[PDB]
Write a protein that binds this DNA or RNA. Structure first.
Ligand SMILES: [Mg+2]
Ligand SMILES: [Mg+2]
Length: 38
RNA sequence: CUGUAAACUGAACCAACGGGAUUGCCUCGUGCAGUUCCGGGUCUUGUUUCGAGACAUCUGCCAGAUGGGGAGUUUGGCU
């Protein structure tokens, strides 16, 4: 039937949760964002 | 009210789904076969996360002190 995984804190290995916002983008990618925000 | 918080008390392990949708199928009740989202909370004008922050450190300048750490030179004549 079900298997329930709680991807809570410390209790199970999460799935491939999208990071895409805390990742280290290549220089120009961040630099063209820090430009339109500056 | 308003906030991510489902977990060990002298050595355990946890990593690749449930459902609904979409297409035909043994069809439309039931289903076999590709597929999509859901969740395990939707967007961000948007920094990787904090912390300091127009102060700094120290970026660059000059300035004043200090500075045998170091450099260069000197360390007269008589007799
Ligand atoms: Mg660039
Ligand atoms: Mg001398």
């Amino acid at each position: 039937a079900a298997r329930p995984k709680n991807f809570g804190i410390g209790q199970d290995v999460p799935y491939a949760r999208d990071l895409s916002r805390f990742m280290r983008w290549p220089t120009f990618v961040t630099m063209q964002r820090k430009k339109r925000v500056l």
